Design a protein around this nucleic acid. Structure first.
Lengths: 107, 91, 78, 94, 92, 96, 77, 89
DNA sequence: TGACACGTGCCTGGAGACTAGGGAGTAATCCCCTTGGCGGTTAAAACGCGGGGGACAGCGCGTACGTGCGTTTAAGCGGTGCTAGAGCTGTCTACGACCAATTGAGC
DNA sequence: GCTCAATTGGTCGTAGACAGCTCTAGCACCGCTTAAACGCACGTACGCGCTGTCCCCCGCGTTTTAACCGCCAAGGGGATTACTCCCTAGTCTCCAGGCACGTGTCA
């Protein structure tokens, strides 16, 4: 009778029950089947880990140890997949990539 | 209030065990998660009515993920999504 | 006549961040006219939201929503 | 004295590396009210809302200059001119 | 059954141009047009209702959705038409 | 004796059907009585707007049925319909 | 089959766009761009066809693929 | 001399400009890689053709201005490449 | 040095259980529209000739842009002062969801 | 022609309209400091106007080939239907995950 979380069952860190409630209360459908929130939580955790890996690598690549928005921007615009997904996002304090056009360099 | 700020930390500790995160980047992560959540739920919500069904099942999420995500993200996201579900139903 | 407060140096520094090496002297006024329109389009939405809520203080989430409608989703303030 | 066009490269390499806001705060702070007064009198503003407007505007202008430089390159010039902005905007659809 | 707006578009056309007929193709275009804008307005009203934390759609929400969605003159007339309608409906 | 609510508002578009769509569409859990009357009035105004210009185009062509070419010739001439439907493209519509 | 999109057809389409004079190299680029557009739309269409478990691709699948890609098409329902 | 009259004719006219059979075979060729032995409804190919020709017409309309900016009369490949770059395609 | 990390009280958001009932998984018959094939003809596509127009490389040149030193001005940071108004609390009734019986607008 | 879905009548649960209270932070003012903008100067790099020339596109003609039309076969699978059942919402309990608020030390 000892309660144990559905996230622990699924091997997930993200909160399965909170996702399930957000679906049920979001007006997205009249019913929400029992497998939908586990799948969605796993998908979100994958994308989170994919971002944070690249952010940590950019931190080491700048000899910093604290991730900051510059590192997120570099983690996103230096991947041809993440950049296709995050097409409309503007990131505050993110700045830009270094990319001068070769036409304009000295002769 | 509600935020994801415990869980993003718990993932960071698994993936980079030295590193910390500023709360200023925590807010960016939280908004990113809410964005992707709303996209996936929206497109799953379409497929139900395009098929004249009342429910959302795992098939709707699988298809919305395949449509929204690019191919190389989609293959792995779907793969371990089915892994997680297979564990859940086998537990 | 505060629109002149976007000084010529500011437009130069902005164009420099975009990689522009050399700028013709009429670019400044066209940039000011472009900005004025973009500001008016965003504020007209933000003030509509502020009025519908019957607040008086315009709030940052109102601008987040205006940008989300106009396709320029902004992370970080909400 | 440096010859022309070398310092522009150092400026670009700096301002693309840094992340500070390039517009002065207080003048834009006044400008926002001088516009909004046309829509309602005695409006009042959160500081965060002005900071969000500033971030959006600087992102928009940098995004427009990145496209505008391609028009100059396509005409085999290096000086951007107003018709470059006009063309870029007309193609972009705005 | 293939329920449609076509028999209403017929009435509006007859009111505007009593001599003028309509092809099946233009009818399909008009019906798709109406089934588009209906969804756009209802969706935008939905977002306004949730951002205020209200249980209820009311004419204030539809009015503000119209004001945000439609360009200037179309909105300016449409708001006056909707207000005149809802008043005279309340008068009955 | 029933008098249909559309006739009470004097609209042509069906306040019944529109309220059925608003309820069945999961837009919100409750829908107040002014919403469908207001929405029908707006949709009727926009339909009359489009049909008026389409018929004017047909009359200038010395024809009598509006055909999709006439609809494209209408929408692409109005400086505000071309903002509402800027991304929409019309089958057989052609170009100006 | 891409060489089945004839040079006359490309010429007619560019003439509808008002191009008066056309370089001899435009044709292979136009074929490439048409092919990548078609492939994207057909992928989305078949993805809807598979989720519906249908074997026929319907006009609704194309209309939805076009809408999701951001270009609304009227007339086919 | 004739090209301007051709422009008038094809802008005034409303027919489809790509022959049907080759476009249909191209579509069925492409589809095979995503699922085998599909069928296509008769109108599905019409919807695809009505999309693709309008898309190219718009691309050529943009390409024309991209050419005029160079003070050229003729459109060239790099005009299409600029158009797609600025359009963000 | 002051932002993030570790600690505490605590409370309402999650989990285990049973009931109820209807959405959709299922197996069948159908019939219509898609695929396949024929003759044929003549619309459009393809190959050659001819040339003069549009593209463009070399050149001249000058005016518009940049880089610098000095003047100043209004921006930036800090302090006190305050009271409008966002936000929470307590109350209660106007109204909008659900059921039924009816019959006519729409197909 | 005829049917199913919109209309009128009633119940009644509640959430949102009104009034109060509050304590946050947005507005206003004082001053000091000086970063940044503004002005003037001139040197030279780039954009613009012109010439000569050339090769590759436009326009005409004859050939030819396969797109198209129309009729005939037939059978795969979109569509509808009746049955069933196992799945998910509603309710109730009860308990611990993580939320304000605090503290301090090192990137």
């Amino acid at each position: 009778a000892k309660a144990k979380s559905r996230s622990s069952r699924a091997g997930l860190q993200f909160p399965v029950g909170r996702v399930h409630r957000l679906l049920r209360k979001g007006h997205y459908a009249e019913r929400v089947g029992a497998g939908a929130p586990v799948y969605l939580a796993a998908v979100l955790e994958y994308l989170t880990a994919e971002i944070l890996e690249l952010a940590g690598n950019a931190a080491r690549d700048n000899k910093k140890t604290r991730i900051i928005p510059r590192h997120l921007q570099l983690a996103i615009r230096n991947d041809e997949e993440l950049n296709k997904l995050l097409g409309g996002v503007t990131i505050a304090q993110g700045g830009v990539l270094p990319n001068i056009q070769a036409v304009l360099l000295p002769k | 209030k509600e935020s994801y700020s415990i869980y993003v930390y718990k993932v960071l500790k698994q993936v980079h065990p030295d590193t910390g995160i500023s709360s200023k980047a925590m807010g960016i992560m939280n908004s990113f998660v809410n964005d992707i959540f709303e996209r996936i739920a929206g497109e799953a919500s379409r497929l139900a009515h395009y098929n004249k069904r009342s429910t959302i099942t795992s098939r709707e999420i699988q298809t919305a993920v395949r449509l929204l995500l690019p191919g190389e993200l989609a293959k792995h996201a779907v793969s371990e999504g089915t892994k997680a579900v297979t564990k859940y139903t086998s537990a | 006549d505060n629109i002149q407060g976007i000084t010529k140096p500011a437009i130069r520094r902005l164009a420099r961040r975009g990689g522009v090496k050399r700028i013709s002297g009429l670019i400044y006024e066209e940039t000011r006219g472009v900005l004025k329109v973009f500001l008016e389009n965003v504020i007209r939405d933000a003030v509509t939201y502020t009025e519908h809520a019957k607040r008086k203080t315009v709030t940052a989430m109102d601008v987040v929503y205006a940008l989300k409608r106009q396709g320029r989703t902004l992370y970080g303030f909400g | 004295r440096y010859r022309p066009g070398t310092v522009a490269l150092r400026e670009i390499r700096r301002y693309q590396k840094s992340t500070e806001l390039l517009i002065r705060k207080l003048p834009f702070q006044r400008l926002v009210r001088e516009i909004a007064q046309d829509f309602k009198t005695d409006l009042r503003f959160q500081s965060s809302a002005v900071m969000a407007l500033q971030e959006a505007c600087e992102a928009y202008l940098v995004g427009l200059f990145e496209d505008t430089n391609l028009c100059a390159i396509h005409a085999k010039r290096v000086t951007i001119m107003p018709k470059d902005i006009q063309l870029a905007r007309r193609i972009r659809g705005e």
